[PDB]
Design a protein around this ligand. Structure first.
Ligand SMILES: Cc1cc2nc3c(=O)[nH]c(=O)nc-3n(C[C@H](O)[C@H](O)[C@H](O)COP(=O)(O)O)c2cc1C
Ligand code: SF4
Ligand code: SF4
Ligand code: SF4
Ligand code: FES
Ligand code: FES
Ligand SMILES: [K+]
Lengths: 432, 263, 214, 45
């Protein structure tokens, strides 16, 4: 029936077999693992079949989105109007804590390119636009020698795997901006213009890069696709829970003994995750003061909720936060949470593309007022003003960077108002 | 035919498919306050003053670029819509410099008028504002770029209307500055019209610079004679003296623009 | 700093001698053919980056040359040059230290590594060395936060550092030799510091439980 | 034969030139396909 507990994912069941670079990341090791198996049959089975199994597996957005891959990829099943349908894969990973895409792409790029081939066959896409964050130079260099090897083997290109589907991959650099992780900002960046997100509609589905029908995806999202297609949706549906199913490549960092990134089955309580893999938070479980879940965009969670809540989108929503990209960052007692959120929102201010008014102005306003808070120069009233400003930012931005910068402030206020109050009281007392 | 019925805060109207929400509201008479959308220019959804509440919809949508759909009663006067307008303008009007007595846009600033109509009456900005150095772009347009709101109207006018694509943006974040990077010379025949597309006094008329507060000048309609086009214009005259010439809307002669030679 | 307003200088002026090698033009052709025709300005990102790859710091003449190569208006090149990160519009030393200071990276006293950089070079945040070798600036979360506070020079990451580990690499670059791009305390890619909590078994075999006639 | 579970072989990324991206992108150019045509050679035409 229902799996009573989740955790200790089977080693052979881990999708990223070379996550730690223990295997040949080129074609030979990839085929030894099982990459590029039964591709011919996968393309022959058809986009309808691939879309059926992607629904059966039931992948919520692995790139911190949450939207099911089923309907998102079904948006590219309408007959072609003549414009060249494309597939796009996002690999920005500028999010504080995001390290899984870089690791997989420098260790298992062949699985990624096989996800692009199979996915694009499902998508009706002419080729893939695999966009790599410009800081990851050697990672892109590795993925593209892998791509060249695949082209030599004939797996990707004209008549891919002897199927007639003329899919291709284009390796795209990016001159560096976290806003480029946003799907429409990604469209704009790869279009040679600024990395400013566009307003939807027109959705990325009908109108994408160069106006052609496209669809974005995360590196992990498409990378897990070929393995689950070969195995079937049952493998992914078995692990994890309902809705939030399968596996997610968790990243662990912060004040832990072993700040590692590991693959583990889905919907696992944090209590096991930090202790068994990361060697526990430095100073024991008692020393743990707070934990931010996947992505700094998701509000931080006090230790009173992390030990019980599982790592699944719905449960983190119940935990007044989000699952994000499984970038669990832990802060111990010695950490100054106020200054940590200070540096975090300073990063957000540095990353704002400035298009829409709410982000461009409110994030800077938050930076200044909250730095004053960190120092302690404030009256107890300004906490409510900061909360209201966080509400103002939310929902009025073209892209979700505004929401992702407003949420940490909301979490900080809600979970540590008295710490702020005592900080500012000490500031009032020290000066006379 | 294809006319789809769309309600606005109640009463319904017949709307052509593909029409933006703000045009549907204009069909009745109530107008979304805006800073980024000009009727004869491309849309950008940038000012976020075009936000409005869709009935039974979680988040507000931008009326500037929103293809209206079936039904969709547009709650123009909803409390959430008013709150969204209030917050968006509070963000707009934070780094705006204290130049209203010294800025020629005074009295016809648009931003001032929206503040009077849909805006707060007190400032909670407890920090220092932002200042941007001026970039000279001619003896024809006064440039105070610290007053700009990055509504991108000037850039789109340069790209589509004038065709001289030299007016752009630089940087990112709150330090984004709209200008020309290089000290370039924007000398198209339609440059002066940027004075009338800039909602704020960021770009003004140098020859007329602080000659009359525009709440005094009487306006008399007439026709330009510098060219055989005969563009409809309005002469702004105070105290028996001509101050400036502004374009009049005709849609058949000059749209709402005139040449710098005419202006 | 980082002013987004160019000014006419003897070093950075429209006159400034900039061009591309024939190999650079071959690379630019490769960049162009990657993208569909009609929409060719989309290739403005790599080619201008290619300019960096042959010049590092990019003069205004470099932007104008890229604009004339790609048949794109010059300010459309200026916008992408001044809106994205890197793309150094001012001359910098050949080596370019970038230490992340974001919250996940800062938690393990990244400021200790920052002050160690400062004391080793004597320069502060921003300014390059008097000998024009290194450039002390900070960066956001570049994507290696899972490791210990780490730095990137040019195109070489180094992970799992310590205020001590940076000294050796710094005087290695100062001595000319290149350090090995990788973590400085075990942990090849991202494994647990204690050991291998997972991926500890031989990998899956081709044909693992597939539905045969899938 | 013995699979070493504690070794790294992603070492060729160490000895990568500053042009390595385009150095094999140019070679990969051969294994490609005609790009679709938008008609006009420029959006300004
Ligand atoms: C500011 C911002 C940054 C983002 N960065 C990333 C990113 O680095 N990687 C990513 O996969 N998605 C990122 N996203 C989410 C994308 O917009 C998009 O929803 C996602 O790539 C879809 O992933 P999926 O196909 O796995 O659902 C970002 C979104 C925003 C608003
Ligand atoms: S929130 Fe608005 S201003 Fe900020 S990056 Fe997104 S689109 Fe740009
Ligand atoms: S443009 Fe600025 S300074 Fe001038 S009246 Fe308007 S708000 Fe005041
Ligand atoms: S200079 Fe004027 S027209 Fe241009 S973006 Fe700023 S406010 Fe708008
Ligand atoms: S009209 Fe909504 S932002 Fe310009
Ligand atoms: S925190 Fe330093 S790279 Fe993410
Ligand atoms: K004006």
């Amino acid at each position: 029936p229902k799996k009573t507990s989740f955790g200790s994912l089977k080693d052979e069941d881990r999708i990223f077999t070379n996550l730690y670079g223990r295997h040949d990341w080129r074609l030979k090791g990839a085929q030894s693992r099982g990459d590029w198996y039964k591709t011919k049959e996968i393309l022959l089975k058809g986009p309808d079949w691939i879309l059926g199994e992607v629904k059966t597996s039931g992948l919520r957005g692995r790139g911190g989105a949450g939207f099911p891959t089923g309907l998102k990829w079904s948006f590219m099943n309408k007959p072609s109007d003549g414009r060249p349908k494309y597939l796009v894969v996002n690999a920005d990973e500028g999010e504080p804590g995001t390290c899984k895409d870089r690791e997989i792409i420098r260790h298992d790029p062949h699985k990624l390119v096989e996800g692009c081939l199979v996915g694009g066959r499902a998508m009706g896409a002419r080729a893939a636009y695999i966009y790599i964050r410009g800081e990851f130079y050697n990672e892109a260099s590795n993925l593209q020698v892998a791509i060249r090897e695949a082209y030599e083997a004939g797996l990707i290109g004209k008549n891919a795997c002897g199927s007639g589907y003329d899919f291709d991959v284009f390796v795209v650099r990016g001159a560096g901006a976290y806003i480029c992780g946003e799907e429409t900002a990604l469209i704009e960046s790869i279009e040679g213009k600024q990395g400013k997100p566009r307003l939807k509609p027109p959705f990325p589905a009908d109108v994408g890069v160069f106006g052609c029908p496209t669809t974005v995806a995360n590196v992990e999202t498409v990378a897990v696709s070929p393995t689950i297609c070969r195995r079937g949706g049952a493998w992914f549906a078995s692990f994890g829970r309902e809705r939030n199913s399968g596996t997610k490549l968790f990243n662990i960092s912060g004040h832990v003994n072993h700040p590692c990134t590991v693959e583990e089955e889905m919907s696992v309580p944090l209590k096991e995750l930090i202790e068994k893999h990361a060697g526990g938070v430095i100073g024991g479980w008692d020393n743990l003061l707070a934990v931010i879940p996947g992505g700094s965009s998701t509000p931080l969670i006090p230790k009173s909720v992390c030990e019980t809540v599982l790592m699944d989108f719905d449960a983190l929503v119940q935990a007044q936060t989000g699952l994000g990209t499984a970038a669990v960052i832990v802060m111990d007692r010695s950490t100054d949470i106020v200054k940590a959120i200070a540096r975090l929102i300073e990063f957000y201010k540095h990353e704002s593309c400035g298009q829409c008014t709410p982000c461009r102005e409110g994030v800077d306003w938050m930076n200044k007022v909250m730095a004053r808070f960190v120092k302690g120069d404030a009256r107890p009233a300004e906490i409510d003003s900061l909360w209201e400003i966080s509400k103002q930012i939310e929902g009025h931005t073209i892209c979700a960077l505004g929401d992702g910068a407003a949420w940490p402030v909301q979490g900080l206020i809600r979970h540590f108002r008295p710490e702020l109050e005592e900080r500012m009281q000490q500031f009032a007392l020290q000066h006379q | 035919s294809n006319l789809i019925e769309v309600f606005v805060d109640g009463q319904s109207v017949m709307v052509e498919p593909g029409t933006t929400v703000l045009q549907a509201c204009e069909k009745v008479g109530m107008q979304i306050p805006r800073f980024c959308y000009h009727e004869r220019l491309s849309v950008a959804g940038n000012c976020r003053m075009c936000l409005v509440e869709i009935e039974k919809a979680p988040k507000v949508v931008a009326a500037c670029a929103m293809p209206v759909m079936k039904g969709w009663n547009i709650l123009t006067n909803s409390e959430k819509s008013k709150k969204a307008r209030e917050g968006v303008m509070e963000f707009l009007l934070a780094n705006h410099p204290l130049d209203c007595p010294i800025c020629d846009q005074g009295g016809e600033c648009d931003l001032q008028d929206q503040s009077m109509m849909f805006g707060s009456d007190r400032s909670r900005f407890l920090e220092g504002k932002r200042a941007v150095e001026d970039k000279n772009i001619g003896p024809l347009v006064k440039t105070i770029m610290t007053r700009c709101i990055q509504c991108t109207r000037c850039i789109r006018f340069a790209s589509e209307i004038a065709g001289v694509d030299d007016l752009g943006t630089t940087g990112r974040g709150n330090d984004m500055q709209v200008g020309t990077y290089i000290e370039k010379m924007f000398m198209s025949e339609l440059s002066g019209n940027i004075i009338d597309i800039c909602p704020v006094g960021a770009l003004t008329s140098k020859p007329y610079a602080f000659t009359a507060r525009p709440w005094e000048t009487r306006k008399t309609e007439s026709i330009d004679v510098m060219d055989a086009v005969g563009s409809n214009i309005v002469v702004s005259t105070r105290t028996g003296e001509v101050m400036r010439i502004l374009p009049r809307m005709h849609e058949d002669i000059n749209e709402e623009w005139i040449s710098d030679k005419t202006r | 700093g980082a002013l987004f307003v160019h000014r006419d200088t003897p070093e950075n002026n429209p006159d400034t001698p900039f061009d591309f090698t024939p190999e650079n033009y071959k690379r630019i052709e490769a960049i162009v053919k990657n993208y569909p025709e009609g929409h060719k300005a989309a290739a403005v990102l790599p080619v201008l980056d290619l300019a960096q790859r042959q010049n590092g710091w990019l003069p205004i003449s470099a932007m104008n040359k890229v604009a004339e190569i790609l048949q794109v208006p010059p300010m459309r090149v200026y916008e992408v040059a001044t809106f994205y990160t890197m793309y150094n519009r001012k001359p910098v030393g050949k080596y370019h230290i970038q230490v992340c200071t974001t919250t996940p990276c800062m938690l393990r006293n990244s400021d200790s590594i920052l002050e160690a950089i400062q004391k080793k070079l004597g320069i502060k945040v921003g300014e390059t060395t008097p000998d024009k070798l290194f450039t002390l600036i900070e960066v956001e979360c570049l994507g290696a936060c899972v490791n210990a506070p780490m730095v990137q020079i040019n195109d070489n990451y180094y992970e799992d550092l310590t205020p001590k580990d940076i000294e050796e690499i710094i005087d290695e670059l100062k001595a000319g030799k290149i350090p090995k791009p990788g973590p400085r305390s075990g942990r090849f890619s991202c494994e647990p510091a204690g050991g291998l909590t997972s991926l500890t078994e031989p990998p899956k075999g081709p044909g693992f439980g597939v539905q045969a006639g899938l | 034969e013995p699979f070493d579970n504690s070794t790294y072989r992603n070492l060729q990324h160490h000895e990568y030139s500053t042009y390595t991206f385009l150095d094999l992108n140019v070679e990969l150019s051969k294994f490609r396909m005609p790009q679709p045509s938008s008609g006009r050679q420029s959006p300004r035409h």
